[PDB]
Symmetry: C3
Subunit: 525 residues, 3 copies
């Protein structure tokens, strides 16, 4: 009750009305007075440290589009395929012109095409959101959170805006059935930007594909299949849309290049109809979208699992394509490698890490089965291959299971300011900090030591709802002489899921996404 | 006019004629589609300007 | 920027239109054109923050394209934003003026077209 500390209705409004004159992005000029003996400290100028970092902007969730780890005539995705196929061939009098997968393959190709077009839409839409209190927003966010050359977009928006609308109309003439629950997800994920609070000043997360999928009936003997080419993205050069369309064109002109695929498009309109197909909407003259405050999404974050569990190491990732052997089974299971920051070839004296039995945290006291399902699949399981290794080896791994997204690596950014501008465009640097999900007591944000595992630049706490950080402690540091692990993150109502219990859920969850059958006990058009 | 035609028809798409959008332009009208797509908005606005100029010619 | 500065209204009107010397379109017409611009800089003079004027390369040299005109505005604003102090000021202003106590320039419609006055 403030009424207490107020001697006068006035005197209060008089010395309490402090200003909140710090726009998110400007530096937090906080200061720390300190006293020491200059003789015993390796060079430290004054005894007053003025702040200089701005509140964190947000975090980039580099994810690898997922269809659900599948390697069986039964692992869901294939089931789904047969499912769909049946409904198309259902009341069709032609002859077997392509097996179940051949079809399914085509569809997904179309889906993934949209996943690009959508991120593009997002780019154009958000170029209109400006807020007097977040100087990050307009520009800086694009360049760091979405990895899109803003300066380039600004110069040629109108053209891109109109180009998008054209593509949209093209895409809307491609046989993708509007009933695939999976689409709705991917659409929502790459269409918005989520806030971590109902406040605009707060930080915000964003999802960004780490690449795309091309269609190709030449790449593997077994038949048509989808190849994944990496988005040159890992903090390299913040890409311009120019490049983003050129790739979509490649993508669709590729789906169109297979006579078989087209013959399929046909079979689909035959069985679904004018409006049985997905349609992405154009963009008006006014359109402008806004950052959203979706709690469910934050939860997904907090709980998720980062593949690159610790940026202090070097990660790989191959065999991300999706193939099909003996005309009836779909295949996809990405595999990677883990080496040290020095010998990109060996692992040496560093330590590979992945989490198994993990935590699950609910911000609601009475979590319902519903809330679980949703807050889950964003978390995945990674299993090592050999049981043991040598410094001269590589540490190989597969992905047991995961959600529809699969978070690869995560970075957050802040502005650091500089009074003495030796330049001008050099007096407001935007720097990143790697976010490691697994770490060790006494780690440092210097790749340098700590068995090759970095700690996190402590300012990450600014992200209310950040992923659970699991820190391991040597039996030494532990008060119980038995080694274990410490938990980090705003816990409220926690609980634990088994490696196996998690796999089992996604195995299901993903299947649900591409599930069709529910259009087999009743027919349309 | 042929220019107007070019800009206008860049919006017609039909699920049953994969020729239409592109291919037709390149062969039937002899107009670089890939080029138009990249810079439509600019051409659209340019056309409208010219139109106003032409409409001031006797 | 506070919407109450009478000075703004002037400069706005002066560089927004083109004036005729008669009610006739055939007549001749005058126009106002800045000979340059002003940058913000807290480094240029010891005494403190200050505004520097760089000549528009204009005196019947090469008739400039907008490409160049935006690039300079970007410089201009990214410059005002570069002073931590200045931002801390922006804040103090919203605190005392409010959402609509500030100046606002209006966008341009699909139809918009202005006329010589």
């Amino acid at each position: 009750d403030w009424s207490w500390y107020a001697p006068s209705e006035l005197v209060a409004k008089q010395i309490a009305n402090v200003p909140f004159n710090v726009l998110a992005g400007t530096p937090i000029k906080a200061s720390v007075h300190l006293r020491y003996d200059p003789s015993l400290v390796s060079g430290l100028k004054d005894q007053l440290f003025v702040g200089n970092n701005a509140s964190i902007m947000g975090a980039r969730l580099l994810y690898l589009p997922s269809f659900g780890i599948s390697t069986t005539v039964l692992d869901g995705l294939s089931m789904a395929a047969n499912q769909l196929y049946a409904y198309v061939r259902k009341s069709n009098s032609g002859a077997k012109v392509y097996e179940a997968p051949d079809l399914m393959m085509t569809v997904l190709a179309i889906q993934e095409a949209y996943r690009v077009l959508f991120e593009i839409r997002r780019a154009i839409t958000f170029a209109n959101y400006w807020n007097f209190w977040n100087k990050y927003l307009p520009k800086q966010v694009f360049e760091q959170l979405l990895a899109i050359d803003f300066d380039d977009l600004m110069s040629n928006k109108a053209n891109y805006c109109a180009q998008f609308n054209l593509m949209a109309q093209k895409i809307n003439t491609f046989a993708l059935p509007k009933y695939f629950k999976s689409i709705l997800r991917m659409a929502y994920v790459s269409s918005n930007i989520f806030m971590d609070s109902d406040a605009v000043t707060g930080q915000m997360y964003a999802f960004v594909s780490s690449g795309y999928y091309r269609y190709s009936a030449t790449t593997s003997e077994s038949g048509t299949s989808l190849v994944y080419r990496d988005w040159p993205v890992g903090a390299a050069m913040p890409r311009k849309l120019n490049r983003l369309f050129t790739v979509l064109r490649e993508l669709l002109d590729a789906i169109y290049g297979d006579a078989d695929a087209q013959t399929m498009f046909g079979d689909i309109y035959k069985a679904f109809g004018s409006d049985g197909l997905y349609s992405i909407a154009e963009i008006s003259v006014d359109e402008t979208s806004t950052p959203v405050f979706d709690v469910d999404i934050l939860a997904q974050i907090e709980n998720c699992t980062i593949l690159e569990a610790n940026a202090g190491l070097a990660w790989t990732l191959d065999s991300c394509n999706v193939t099909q052997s003996k005309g009836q089974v779909l295949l996809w299971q990405p595999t990677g490698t883990i080496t040290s920051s020095d010998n990109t070839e060996h692992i040496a004296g560093d330590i590979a890490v992945a989490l198994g039995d993990r935590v699950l945290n609910s911000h609601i006291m009475e979590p319902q089965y519903s809330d679980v399902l949703e807050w889950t699949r964003l978390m995945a399981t990674i299993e090592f291959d050999k049981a043991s290794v040598t410094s001269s080896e590589k540490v190989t791994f597969k992905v047991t299971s995961c959600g529809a997204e699969l978070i690869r690596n995560v970075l957050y950014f802040k502005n650091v300011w500089n009074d003495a501008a030796e330049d001008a465009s050099q007096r407001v640097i935007t720097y990143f900090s790697h976010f490691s999900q697994i770490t060790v007591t006494n780690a440092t944000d210097d790749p340098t030591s700590a068995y090759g595992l970095m700690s996190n630049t402590l300012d990450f706490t600014q992200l209310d709802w950040h992923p659970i950080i699991y820190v391991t402690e040597t039996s030494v540091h532990n008060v119980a002489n038995l080694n274990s692990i410490l938990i980090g993150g705003d816990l409220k109502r926690p609980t634990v899921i088994t490696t196996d219990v998690v796999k089992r859920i996604n195995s299901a969850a993903n299947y649900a996404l591409y599930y069709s059958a529910n259009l087999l006990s009743n027919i349309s058009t």
